[PDB]
Amino acid sequence: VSPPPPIADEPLTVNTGIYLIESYSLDDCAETFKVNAFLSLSWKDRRLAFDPVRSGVRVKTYEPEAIWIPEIRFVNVENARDADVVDISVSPDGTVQYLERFSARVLSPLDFRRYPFDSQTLHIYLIVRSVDTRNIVLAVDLEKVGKNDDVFLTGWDIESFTAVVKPANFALEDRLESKLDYQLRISRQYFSYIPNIILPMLFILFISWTAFWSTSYEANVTLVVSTLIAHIAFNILVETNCPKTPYMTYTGAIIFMIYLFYFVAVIEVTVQHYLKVESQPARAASITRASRIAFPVVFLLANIILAFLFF
Amino acid sequence: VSPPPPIADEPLTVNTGIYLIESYSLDDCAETFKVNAFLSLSWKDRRLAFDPVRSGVRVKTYEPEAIWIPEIRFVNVENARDADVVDISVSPDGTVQYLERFSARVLSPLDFRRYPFDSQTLHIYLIVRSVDTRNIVLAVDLEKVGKNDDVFLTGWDIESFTAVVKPANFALEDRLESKLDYQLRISRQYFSYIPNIILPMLFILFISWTAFWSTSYEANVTLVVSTLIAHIAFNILVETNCPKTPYMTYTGAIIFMIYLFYFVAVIEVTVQHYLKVESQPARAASITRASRIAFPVVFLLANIILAFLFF
Amino acid sequence: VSPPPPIADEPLTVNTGIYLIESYSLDDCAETFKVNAFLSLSWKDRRLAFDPVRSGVRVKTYEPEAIWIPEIRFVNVENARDADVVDISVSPDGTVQYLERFSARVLSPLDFRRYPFDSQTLHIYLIVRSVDTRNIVLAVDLEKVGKNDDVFLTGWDIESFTAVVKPANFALEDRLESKLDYQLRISRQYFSYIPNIILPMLFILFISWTAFWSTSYEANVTLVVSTLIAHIAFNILVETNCPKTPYMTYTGAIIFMIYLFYFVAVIEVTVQHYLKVESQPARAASITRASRIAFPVVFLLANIILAFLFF
Amino acid sequence: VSPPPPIADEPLTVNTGIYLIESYSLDDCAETFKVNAFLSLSWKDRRLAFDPVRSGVRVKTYEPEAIWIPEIRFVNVENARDADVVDISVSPDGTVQYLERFSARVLSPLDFRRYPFDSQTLHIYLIVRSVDTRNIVLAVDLEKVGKNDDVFLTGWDIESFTAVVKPANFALEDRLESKLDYQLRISRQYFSYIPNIILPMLFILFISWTAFWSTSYEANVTLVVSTLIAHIAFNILVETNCPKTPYMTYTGAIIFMIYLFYFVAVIEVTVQHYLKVESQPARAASITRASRIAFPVVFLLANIILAFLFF
Amino acid sequence: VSPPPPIADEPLTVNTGIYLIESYSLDDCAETFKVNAFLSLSWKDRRLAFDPVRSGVRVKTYEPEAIWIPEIRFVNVENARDADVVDISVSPDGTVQYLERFSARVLSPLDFRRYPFDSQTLHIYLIVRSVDTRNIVLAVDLEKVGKNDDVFLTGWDIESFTAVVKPANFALEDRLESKLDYQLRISRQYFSYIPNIILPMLFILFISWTAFWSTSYEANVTLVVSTLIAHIAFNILVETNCPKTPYMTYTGAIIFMIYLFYFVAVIEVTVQHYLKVESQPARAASITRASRIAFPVVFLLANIILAFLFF
Ligand SMILES: CCC1(CCBr)C(=O)NC(=O)NC1=O
Ligand SMILES: [Cl-]
Ligand SMILES: [Cl-]
Ligand SMILES: [Cl-]
Ligand SMILES: [Cl-]
Ligand SMILES: [Cl-]
Known about the structure:
binds chloride ion; alpha+beta; sodium (chains A, B, C, D, E); homopentamer; Acetylcholine Binding Protein, Chain: A; Methane Monooxygenase Hydroxylase, Chain G, domain 1; seven-stranded mixed β-sheet; 32% helix; transmembrane signaling receptor activity (chains A, B, C, D, E)
C-alpha cells in the first residue's frame, strides 16, 4: 500500500481503456450525458511479481484493499463515478490487470450554432495525480478502448468512440498530473425537424403574406397580427426546453428574421392603408404589388445568406 | 471467496430467474422503466458441501459475506440495481440457492411510429463475466421466471414476462460474457385518446371548413386563422411532454397533414376573394363549392393512405 | 443465528404494526405517496429467554446484528425503505420487541373516474418470506396501528389508518408468504374546484351561447371561435399536470361534451347564416330561437345523465 | 454505552439548542424548507466525572463511539438529517457538551389564505425516545438557540428563531417521548406583486370596460372576449406553479370575482345590442350609461368587502 | 487525535486553498451553483516530526483516520460537501500537506436589479471552529487559489477566482470561528437578449402604435388588444423560469411600463372614437396626431430615465 518502486528512474505507466456499455440521458440544456462503461487499468508492480513454478497459479487474484491501485479520477464529472471493481489479476511479472464497471454524469459543452444540423464531440477526461515516491503517467491500450454495438442516443448517429493516445502532462498543486481524452463523436438526426418545425412555421409566415392580395385593412390587420400570435403560440409548442443560448445560432437568426418580417409586413399594411385614405391609391397599390414579389424574394435571399454564413 | 474449482474443466452454470413484483414509472420520453423484482440464482460450490447427519441440518443458511457469489450485473441499467439479499440456502451436495429482491431503472428503447396504437417489448439483460480460474455461463430456471398478477403499468396491457433461454455467450476484453434476455411485452390502452385528443382536434379542423359556406373574407380569415390558433393552443394542452422524436411517426404525419390543410384552406379563401374582387365571381363560387367536397374527401383519403402506410 | 425453534406446529407469528408519523408528496400522476412511519415487530424466541434473577436485568437490549430478526419487506415500494432501528428489547420469556423508524415511496394506484369528488384507499403491503426450518406468518395488533394527529395531505381529508387483520398467505417460488394490507383512506377536498375550475369554465361556454341573440355572422364567428380559444387557454391554465388517463373519467366526459357543444354552436351559426343568405330567414330565425332553449336544456340534461352514470 | 444511572429515580434532562446557519429552498407548493444549522446537546453522565488534578486536564474530549449519546430525531422531516459531529466535551462533574452540524428538509404546512400579505411560522420538532433503564426529557438552553445574522429567505423577512421551552411529553408505542417546538417566524416581503401581478391584471379588466363607451357590437365582442383571453394568458404567465389550494384564498376570491365581471360585461354587451336591435335604443343606452359607473363602483366595493373578510 | 500542543500563544494556522476543477448548474432562481474543486490544507503538528535518517523515508503518508486533521466546513452549502481525500503527506518537521477533491452545492444570493447586464460575485465561505486546548485560525495562500482554464458557466464570463486573505474571526456558542471568503466573479453574456427578447418585444409594442394612423375603431381595437395578447404570449415564450423577484428590477420596471403603454393606447383609441361619435372630429384627430409623436417620445425618455436610475 505504497506505489511500486522504479526499476530505473522513469515514471509509472498506467495503461487505460474505456469500453462503452450504455450511453443515455444526453441533456442538451445541461450539456451533460450519462454513461455506463468499463474502465480497464494496467500497471507493473514488481513487489507482486512471482515465480509460477513455486507459486503454482496462472494469475493471482486480489481484493482492491489488498494491493496498491492508482487513483484514477475523471475531470469533467458532476460527482465521482459509481464504480464497482469487476476483477483484479496479477501475472507472474507483476503486471496488474484491473477492471471496473462505472456509471457517471459527464459534463461536456455543446455548440448549438449549427442546430439541428450539428454534430458534437463528447469528452471524458481521465486523470491521475503523481505521488511522492514516483511520478504517474497515463497511456492508452487501444485494444481495450471501444463501445457496445447496441450503444444508442435517440436522435443521434454515434460515429465513433476513440481516445487521444498522447496524454496531457502538467503541474497542478505542486504535482504532475497526466490527463487523457476519450472522445465520443455524434451527429444529429434532423429529419423530423423539417415536417415538425420548419414547414408549419413557414406556412404561418406565408399566411401573413396573403395581406398583399387584399385592400381590406380590417382583414389585413387580422391576417398579420393573428399570424404573429400563431407564430409565437407555435414557438411555445415546439420550444427547445433549453434556456436561451448566450451565442447567436443559425436557428436563432432565422427566428429573429421571421419577427422582423412580421414587423415589416405590419409597416406595409399600415403604409398601404394610410396612402389609400390620404388620396394616393396609385402608390398604395404599387407598394402592395411590389411586396407580393419583394417579401418572398428578400426572404429566400436572406435565408441563403444565413445558411451560407452558418455552414 | 474465489470461484468454485472445476472437476473436469467444465464452466460454472448459474441458473437464473426473475420474478416481477412491481413495474412502475414507464417514462416514454426517457425510454426507461423502473422495476421491483426477485432475482433467483443457483450454482454448485462443492467447497460448501456438508453431511446432514453430522450437521443435524438438512440445508445450511449463509451470509453473503461468508460464501462466493457470482457477480451478476444488468447490461441496460442506469446504475447498478438496489439489491437486498433475501436468502442463501446450501444443500449437502453444495448447491447454492440465492435470492435477492432488487429495484432497477432499466433503459429499453421504444418505437413510437404506431403511437398510440403501439405495443412494445421491454428488455432486461442479465450478464456475468468469466474468471481466470473458470468460465461462467448463465441458464434460465423457467420455474423461477414469472410476474405477480397485480403487476400494472397505467395505460398498458402487460401481455407476458418471459426469457430467451439460450444465452448470448461472447468474448469481450479477452474473457467470455454470458448474457440473458428477459422480455416484458406490453400493449398500449389507446381508448381515451379518441375523445381526449382525436375528436376535439378534428372538430377545430371542421370549424375551419365552414369558410366554404361563406363569401365574407373578413369572416373567412377569422375562421381559418382563429382555428389555426386554437389548433396550436390545443396541441400545447394535449402535448406528450416528449421532446420531438427523430423519426416520422403516424401521429406526426397526421399533425403535419392538418397544418398543410390550414395553409391550403387559407390559399382557397385568398383565391376566392381575389377572383371576386377581380370581376370573376363565377370561378370564385365554383372553387368554394368544390372545396366543400374536395377538403373532406382528400382528408379522408390521405388519412386512409397514412393509416395504411403505418399499419 | 437461524429462526427460533417451535414446539407448536404453527409457524412463527410476527405481530406487526405501522404508525404514521408524516405523510407527504402525494403525486396523483405518479400514483405514489411518500411516508415516514414506525414499524413495530413482535415475536418470541425462547433461545433468548432468560432468568432475570441470575442475569440481574429485567429487560435485555440487543443490536440488530446480535439476534435473529424476521425479514419484513414492503411489496409496493419504489426501493427498499430507509430504515433506522430505534429499539430492540428482550423480555425473560424470549419475547422480542423490535421498533424501527422508516421512510418509503409507496406505489398505490388511484381511480380518477369520480375526480374531483373521489375518495381513495392507499395501500401498504407488508410481506415476510418463510425460511426452510420454519414458516413465518404476519399478525396485526390494531392497538399498534395508528397515525400522528398532525399527519396531513394538502387537499385531502385523512379518514383512517387501519389494517386488514387476516393476512394473505400464499405460495411463491416454493415458499409461503404471509402478506398484510395496511390501508390509508383519504377523501378529496373539492371546494376550490367550483370557484376555480367549474364556474369559469361554464362562463366561457355561456359566452358562446350569446350567438343565439345575434344575426351578425362576423360577431357570431368571433363569439364561438374566440370562446373556444379561451376554453382551451383556460384548460392549459387549470391543467391537472397529469398525462391523460387511459380510462374515461367523469371530468373527461364533460370536457369532451363541452368541445362537442363548441362544434355544434359553430354548426348552428354556420346554418343560420347560410339560410339567411339563401333567402330563407324564416328557418334561420326559428333555428336560432330554438337553440336559445335547446342548448342550455340539452346541456343540463346531458350533465345530469353523466353525473348519474358516474355517481 | 448504556444510559447514565439516576441517583434518585430522576429522568435524564437533555438540554437542546438550534443555531440557524443557513435557511434556503422554501418550497411553498411542497410546504417544505431546507435548513442548515447547529444542534447542541447537554446532559449529565457521572460515569464520566473526573478529578482535574490527577487527570491533568480541565476538559476531556471523546469520540461519539466512545461514550453514550441520546438519540435525538426530528418529527417533521422528509428523511433523517445529514449530521456531522463537530465536538464532544466533558467537564469535571461529568456534564457532556455535544455539538453537531446538520442539514434537513423540514415539512411544515403553510396557510395561503392571506397571500401575498401572509406571514408563516415554520416548525422544527425535536424528539427523544426514553430508554428501558431511564426516562429521557428534553429542555431548551436559550443561550444555545439563535440564528446567523446573514440567514435569508428570498422574498421573506425572517422575524425570529425561538423555541417553546416546555416540552410535550407523551406516550408512543409503550414509551415516554419528549418533544420540542422550534419556531421560525417569517413574513412575506413581496412588494413587486403590485406592479408585476395586480396592476397588469387590472389594466386588462379596465380595457373590457371601454365597451360601455361603444355601440358597435362587433367592437364590443372583440373587447370583452379578447380581454378575457388576455386575462387567462396573463394568469398562465404569472402562474404560482402551485397546484390549486383546497381552501379559498384572498387571491383566489378576487380572480373568481374578475371571471364573474368578464361574464357580467358580456351579458351587458349582449343585452345592449339586443335592445338596440329590438327597437328600444332608450333602454340600451341607459343600461350602457349605468354600467360605466356600476362596474367600477361594484368592483371597488366588492374588493373592499373581500379585503375586509380576509384581513 | 487531539490538537497539537503549541508553545507559542498564537493559535494553529491552517493554510487553505481552493482550486476550481468544474463549475456547473448555476440556478439563478434557486441562487445556487454546483462546484467540483480541490481543497488543500497545511498545518504543522510537531508530534508528527521525524528523523528521516532513522525512518529511511524523506516523507510519510498517512490515512485520514491515523492523524489529527482540522474540521474544515463550508458556511453556505446545502449539505456538507462530498469529499474524497486525494493525499496526506508528512515531512520530517511535522508539516501536514492535506489535499481532497470535493463537490458541493453552494448557496450564494444574486442581485437581478441590473439583469441581463448584471455581474455577480459568488461566495464560498470556509470555516473552522476552535477546540478546547487551542484556537484554530485560517490562512489563504493565493498561489494555491485558482481555477482550471476549461471552467465554464453557460452565458457567463468567469472573470476571477480569488480569496479575501484576512479571515473573519468571531465568537459563536462560546468558541472562536475563523472564516475565509472565496469569491468567483462572473459577468453575464447579454448579447443574445437583444435579438431574442428586446427587439421582438419592441416590434409588438410598435405594431400597437399603428392605431394612431387609423380612424377605424374595429381595426384599432384589434390592433391594441391583439398586440397585448401577443405581448403576454411572447413573455410566456421567453419566460425566465424564475418565480418573480421580491425587489424591483430594471427589466421588471420596463415590462410594467410596456403594460402601462398598452393601457394608455387603449384609452387613446377609446377617447378618439368617443369624440368622433360625440360630433367632435377636430379633437379626436388632434389627439391621434399628437399620440403619433407623444407615444414614441415618452417611451424613449422614460426608458432613458429607467436606464439611468438602474445604471
Ligand atoms: C383573443 C382571440 C384571438 C385568438 C386568441 Br389566443 C386573438 O388573440 N386575436 C385575434 O385577432 N383573434 C382571435 O381569435
Ligand atoms: Cl471519478
Ligand atoms: Cl446491476
Ligand atoms: Cl422494503
Ligand atoms: Cl432526524
Ligand atoms: Cl462542508
